[model samples]
Target: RRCLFLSLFSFLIVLLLTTLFCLLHFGVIGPQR
Candidate 1:
């Protein structure tokens, strides 16, 4: 179950990071102009 937990945790982190990057790149998460 260790890898399962780790895999899930890493997946969430990767998803979160990608989402953050998308928002940041698209001027959605912060002020961008």
Candidate 2:
């Protein structure tokens, strides 16, 4: 049970990072010139 909880938490972090990178790649984030 403990292992499952950690795995889910890790997956959530990776998902959030992927979303952030995608947004940046598309200019949804960061400065635009």
Candidate 3:
């Protein structure tokens, strides 16, 4: 149970970070605009 939860949490974190990176690169968010 705990192991599965950690795996899911880490997956979510990685996905969130990836999305943020893409958005930043496209100038959809942050100070680059």
Candidate 4:
């Protein structure tokens, strides 16, 4: 159970980072310049 939770937590972090990266790359967020 502990290991499963840890894995899930890490997955969430990675998912969030990937989403943020996609948004920035597509100019959906962050500075335009």
Candidate 5:
């Protein structure tokens, strides 16, 4: 149970970071227009 919870938590963090990175690269954090 603890292992499963850890895996899920890690996955959530990874997904969140990836999403932020994507948004930053393509849409959010870019050179001024």
Candidate 6:
């Protein structure tokens, strides 16, 4: 249903953001390098 789809979409967005955050924290992808 729509609810399930929305939840999955949000989960993916959160996961993507978390990955980006981790990369930035470790200087793997940022301007501080």
TM-score for candidate 2, please give it: 0.53
Best by lDDT: 6
Which candidate, 1 or 3, has the higher TM-score? 1
lDDT of 2 by residue, 2-31 (tens): 798889899999999887777777887573
Q: Give the TM-score of candidate 3.
A: 0.52
Quantify how close model 2 is to the true structure by its C-alpha RMSD in Å: 3.9
- Single out the weakest 10-residue window by summed lDDT for candidate 2: 24-33
Q: Model 4, 1-32: lDDT tens per residue?
A: 37987898999999998887877788876834
Give the distance in Å from residue 32's predicted Cα in candidate 2 to where it truly belongs.
Answer: 7.6
Using TM-score as the yardstick, the better of models 1 and 4 is 1
CA-lDDT, candidates in order:
0.79, 0.79, 0.80, 0.80, 0.77, 0.81
The candidate with the higher TM-score, 1 or 2, is: 2
For model 3, the run of ten residues with the poorest summed lDDT: 24-33
Tens digit per residue, CA lDDT, model 5, 1-33: 369878989998999988777776677765233
TM-score of each: 0.53, 0.53, 0.52, 0.52, 0.52, 0.55
- Span of ten consecutive residues with least summed lDDT in model 5: 24-33
Error of 1 at 29 (Å): 6.9
Candidate 3 structure lDDT = 0.80
Per residue, candidate 1 scores C-alpha lDDT tens digits across 1-33 of 368878888988999988778877888758453
Model 5, C-alpha of 30: deviation from truth (Å): 4.1
Number of clashing pairs per prediction, in order: 0, 0, 0, 0, 0, 0
lDDT of 6: 0.81
